Amino acid sequence: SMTSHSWLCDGRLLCLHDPSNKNNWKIFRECWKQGQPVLVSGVHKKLKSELWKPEAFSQEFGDQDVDLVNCRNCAIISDVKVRDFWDGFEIICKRLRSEDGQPMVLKLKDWPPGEDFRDMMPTRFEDLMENLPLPEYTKRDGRLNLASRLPSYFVRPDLGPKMYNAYGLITAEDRRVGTTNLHLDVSDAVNVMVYVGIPIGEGAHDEEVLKTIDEGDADEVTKERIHDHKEKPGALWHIYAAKDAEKIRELLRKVGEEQGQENPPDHDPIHDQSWYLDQTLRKRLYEEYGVQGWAIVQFLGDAVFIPAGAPHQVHNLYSCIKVAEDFVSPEHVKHCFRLT
Numbered sequence: 001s002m003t004s005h006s007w008l009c010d011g012r013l014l015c016l017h018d019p020s021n022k023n024n025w026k027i028f029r030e031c032w033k034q035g036q037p038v039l040v041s042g043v044h045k046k047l048k049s050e051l052w053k054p055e056a057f058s059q060e061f062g063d064q065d066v067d068l069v070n071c072r073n074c075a076i077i078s079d080v081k082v083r084d085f086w087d088g089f090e091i092i093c094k095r096l097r098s099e100d101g102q103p104m105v106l107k108l109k110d111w112p113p114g115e116d117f118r119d120m121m122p123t124r125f126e127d128l129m130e131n132l133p134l135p136e137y138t139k140r141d142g143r144l145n146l147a148s149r150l151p152s153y154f155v156r157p158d159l160g161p162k163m164y165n166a167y168g169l170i171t172a173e174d175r176r177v178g179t180t181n182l183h184l185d186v187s188d189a190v191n192v193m194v195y196v197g198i199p200i201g202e203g204a205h206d207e208e209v210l211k212t213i214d215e216g217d218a219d220e221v222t223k224e225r226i227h228d229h230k231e232k233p234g235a236l237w238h239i240y241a242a243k244d245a246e247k248i249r250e251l252l253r254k255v256g257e258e259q260g261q262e263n264p265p266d267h268d269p270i271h272d273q274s275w276y277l278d279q280t281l282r283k284r285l286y287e288e289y290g291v292q293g294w295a296i297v298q299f300l301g302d303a304v305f306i307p308a309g310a311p312h313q314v315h316n317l318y319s320c321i322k323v324a325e326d327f328v329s330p331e332h333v334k335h336c337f338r339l340t
């Protein structure tokens, strides 16, 4: 039977089922006030699916100049055509290769660049913004979005949205690497999975995806969305409460020292965006510092709500197109205030 919502993460994560329900705020707002992330499923069913395909981005924008990142070693691939990224999104034999002859796991950096999404892609901008869940929080002009209403004593987010495009991580060694490393944002954000590409050529890599989800500490209900309903899983997230940020900094200063980094005792390993918490580090965070997180699998059409100040990291299971919008809720405005 169709229900308003369910619980993931053993009761600690709200999952809303109807992305456009006029009464969603009644279920959402107490979870949000307590500083929890929230998941909303079904956004893909509201979108024009033809606007969000990798082949359309290549045909329309392929001659633009961009930089890529090799996710395995952080090497920057400078000044290539954006088609060189898109044409290998799902077809492994078309991907740029490393010196060892293997196909690379690539991230497309800063594309579209800066605040240019709306100017470059007006039809896509309209399709995303008209179908965001919790529209009084998430729309530029929402009644509960303070972004356009605050003075300079507050850090204001850029004009969005922003697109996040990267291949899936593939090997046993890739399990310890991030697509996006551990960091925090001073605004709230909603991140929508608009396309998942499951490749061909090495298309049989479904086994290491199951081991990554399991070792990623995913709950038993999350493990059922695959096996029972064959939804397409895009990315594995870990999110931590804003109140636990300093304890995470203490763990990472101690691990940097153990590994022979030479950092002043005050440097900020979260702002540095240089760490990915693998199974070993997540267990050490729990056991040595008392900190538990939320392990979330973002399927096609899932929207992830990330609270301001909450440290978070992202590991792509398959090739993902994500679109995210920043907003400033009244519940979390303290995180962008410039005093005390």
Ligand SMILES: O=C(C1CC1)N1CCN(c2ccc(F)cc2)CC1
Pocket (backbone or CB within 6 Å): 097, 098, 099, 100, 101, 102
């Ligand atoms: O000099 C370099 C690397 C430092 C960037 N490259 C030229 C050769 N490339 C290549 C790899 C596999 C292959 F089948 C053909 C060519 C890899 C990239």
Ligand SMILES: [Cl-]
Pocket (backbone or CB within 6 Å): 035, 242, 309, 331, 332
């Ligand atoms: Cl908070």
Ligand SMILES: [Cl-]
Pocket (backbone or CB within 6 Å): 120, 121, 122, 123, 124, 125
């Ligand atoms: Cl467009």
Ligand SMILES: [Cl-]
Pocket (backbone or CB within 6 Å): 025, 133, 134, 135, 136, 137
């Ligand atoms: Cl709302």
Ligand SMILES: [Cl-]
Pocket (backbone or CB within 6 Å): 179, 180, 181, 273
């Ligand atoms: Cl990163």
Ligand SMILES: [Mn+2]
Pocket (backbone or CB within 6 Å): 183, 184, 185
């Ligand atoms: Mn972020």
